[model samples]
Target: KVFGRCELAAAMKRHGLDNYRGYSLGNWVCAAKFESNFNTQATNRNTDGSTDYGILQINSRWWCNDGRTPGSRNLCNIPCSALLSSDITASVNCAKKIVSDGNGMNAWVAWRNRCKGTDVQAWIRGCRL
Candidate 1:
């Protein structure tokens, strides 16, 4: 599903991403914008033969098991396909695990390069959350 800014914010907030790990809802929204542009089915292949999946672009290398990445840890204990669903429950849950693992939101390069240290509030402007 292609989500609007406020729509994605509401969903992530409902999933407990709001203020998760000191990162605000806007941080998550901003990361998602750069990761997948709010499209749940998005996927991107990595140079190391790993792949990212879903709106948040969870990686197969250490998060989900796609049975393709050379040494996937599958720390989230879920199939990578689960992240691609239009229903974002699996994606949100996995993202929580990623953050709680001490990586913070920097797990995604898109977030680190594009969303980090920016005025993320602009990503959620005009949205009542």
Candidate 2:
């Protein structure tokens, strides 16, 4: 199969098949929109030869080991968090955690409540995450 937008979307749908959670898709969409603007193969440069670098923004160099006896650490780009068992969920959850884990957006939420019937951003701004 050609690895294009449709293919990627299909994969996401398939992988997300288990995501019956109401806010799951929205959460992932938010993550995609922010992280790489939906760029599947997004990458970053690493000054060192190994710590972390790869799609899913994985810094495998520093973290990934092929279950080998010898250890190999490399340059860095992606954070170690994404390397967790289920990276996709990890990435999504991380985003929510970051945005919501701060100062109260109560005013924003209240304003959004008033604008709920009118604007999406207005209401969502209160969610923070």
Query: How many pairs collide in each candidate, listed in order?
Result: 0, 8
Off by over 4 Å in 1: none
TM-score of each: 0.96, 0.33
As a TM-score, model 2 comes out at 0.33
**Model 2: per-residue Cα lDDT over 1-129, one tens digit each:** 123333333344555521333333333333333334445445454454433211134334444432221344422223453434323444333333333534321212322343223432321233323
Candidate 1, residues 1-129: lDDT per residue as tens digits? 899999999999999998988888999999999999999999999999999999999999999999989988999999999999988999999999898887788788999999888999998899978
Error of 1 at 118 (Å): 0.9
Position 82, candidate 2: lDDT: 40
Model 2 has an lDDT value of 0.35
Error of 1 at 104 (Å): 1.4
